[PDB]
């Protein structure tokens, strides 16, 4: 198996994790299980704590930065790690029992269980024009040395790292999302009927989207061309609320539909951050420089749910449009964008792999 790790500036403390992206379903959220490597001597009476903060920040580009103009803590979890507190004691994963047995006795566990209905790691990076500042919700894991809880944490023997809460939806049976509209122009009751659908409700980053477009033209006009698009919507709803709208995929085609005939076709779009990187105002599931970053996924929420508490609400839509030689006739279908997903361990850094940038 493979596990990531990171050490404190003075290598006296070292965190060990088997993932840096925790997959949350709806029922449950993969548990955040890791262990610390301590130097009992180095810290006399001092202790080892590990905390999981979940918060929304606005202004800077991360929680640890001291230039953000707003912050709301959405979750916090502290655990007395070194001095094993019989109180704060749990069952233990296997990657743990495994790890502890390779690190020794100075190996100590900790485990965090993230409530199912908390927002997922989402970051919205403002453009050049946009008057808003960056913001997002991040999960910070911090293990540190101190006697009491409160003493002053020092960047010296403390370690910090951002993990990720990614959303996965299993794809159900349901009907394909449909949308239709009829249009009658000036001086005639002859209609132009549009109707589209997507092959399914749930998609995953990188997974293609198929659009079945059917056009019934009883009109005496002509459909010049057809434009298919996939837009993203981001509603920052906390410090300084605003709504960002951004296209993540377009596919215009010179398809023609003659007077009194029926048209039919299947288009394929692929929303990919790669072909949008140089864009801004959109929401991502991380920072741009990181390679393992995608487009922010659809914010889920159902019945009596607090919307502000989620930070940034994200949604997607596919728009179909016919340019008729005017007023185009169009429809739109909403979809959900989700996330995919005798050993030997072998530690590896925690830092997220980078891009290519000049």
From Swiss-Prot:
Mutating residue 319 to Q leads to what result? Impairs InsP6-binding and oligomerization
Q: Which residues carry this modification: Phosphotyrosine?
A: 42
Regions crossing the membrane: none
Outcome (variant: residue 152 to Q) = Impairs InsP6-binding and oligomerization
Which compartments is it annotated to reside in?
A: Cytoplasm; Nucleus; Cell membrane; Membrane, Clathrin-coated pit
Q: How is it modified after translation?
A: At the plasma membrane, is rapidly dephosphorylated, a process that is required for clathrin binding and ADRB2 endocytosis but not for ADRB2 binding and desensitization. Once internalized, is rephosphorylated. The ubiquitination status appears to regulate the formation and trafficking of beta-arrestin-GPCR complexes and signaling. Ubiquitination appears to occur GPCR-specific. Ubiquitinated by MDM2; the ubiquitination is required for rapid internalization of ADRB2. Deubiquitinated by USP33; the deubiquitination leads to a dissociation of the beta-arrestin-GPCR complex. Stimulation of a class A GPCR, such as ADRB2, induces transient ubiquitination and subsequently promotes association with USP33.
Which SMART domains does the record cross-reference, listed alphabetically?
Arrestin_C
Q: What's this protein's function?
A: Functions in regulating agonist-mediated G-protein coupled receptor (GPCR) signaling by mediating both receptor desensitization and resensitization processes. During homologous desensitization, beta-arrestins bind to the GPRK-phosphorylated receptor and sterically preclude its coupling to the cognate G-protein; the binding appears to require additional receptor determinants exposed only in the active receptor conformation.
Record-stated family: Belongs to the arrestin family.
What is the name of the protein in this document?
Beta-arrestin-1
Q: Which organism is it from?
A: Bos taurus
Point out the gene that encodes the protein: ARRB1
């Amino acid at each position: 198996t493979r596990v990531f790790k990171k050490a404190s500036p003075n290598g006296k403390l070292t965190v060990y994790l088997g993932k840096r992206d925790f997959v949350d379903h709806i029922d449950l959220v993969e548990p955040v299980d890791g262990v610390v490597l301590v130097d009992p001597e180095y810290l006399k009476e001092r202790r080892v704590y590990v905390t999981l903060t979940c918060a929304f920040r606005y202004g800077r580009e991360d929680l640890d930065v001291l230039g953000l103009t707003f912050r709301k803590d959405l979750f916090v979890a502290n655990v007395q790690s070194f001095p094993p507190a019989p109180e704060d004691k749990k069952p233990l994963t296997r990657l743990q029992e495994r790890l502890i047995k390779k690190l020794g006795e100075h190996a100590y566990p900790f485990t965090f269980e993230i409530p199912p209905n908390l927002p997922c790691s989402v970051t919205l990076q403002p453009g050049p024009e946009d008057t808003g500042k960056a913001c997002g919700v991040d999960y910070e894991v911090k293990a540190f040395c101190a006697e009491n809880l409160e003493e002053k944490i020092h960047k010296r023997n403390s370690v910090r790292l951002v993990i990720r809460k990614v959303q996965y939806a299993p794809e159900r049976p349901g009907p394909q999302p449909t949308a239709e509209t009829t249009r009658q122009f000036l001086m005639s009751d002859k209609p132009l009927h549009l109707e589209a659908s997507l092959d399914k409700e749930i998609y995953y980053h990188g997974e293609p989207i198929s659009v079945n477009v059917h056009v019934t033209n009883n009109t005496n006009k002509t459909v010049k061309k057809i434009k298919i698009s996939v837009r993203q919507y981001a509603d920052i709803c906390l410090f300084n609320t605003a709504q960002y709208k951004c296209p993540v995929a377009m596919e215009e085609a010179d398809d023609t539909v003659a007077p009194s005939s029926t048209f039919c076709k299947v288009y394929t779009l692929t929303p990919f951050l790669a072909n949008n990187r140089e864009k801004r105002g959109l929401a991502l599931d991380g920072k741009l420089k990181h390679e393992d970053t995608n487009l922010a996924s659809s914010t889920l929420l159902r019945e009596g749910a607090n919307r502000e508490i989620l930070g940034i609400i994200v949604s997607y839509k596919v728009k179909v449009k016919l340019v008729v030689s005017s007023s185009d006739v169009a429809v739109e279908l909403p979809f959900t964008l989700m996330h995919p997903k005798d050993d030997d361990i072998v530690f590896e850094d925690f830092a997220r792999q980078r891009l290519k940038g000049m």
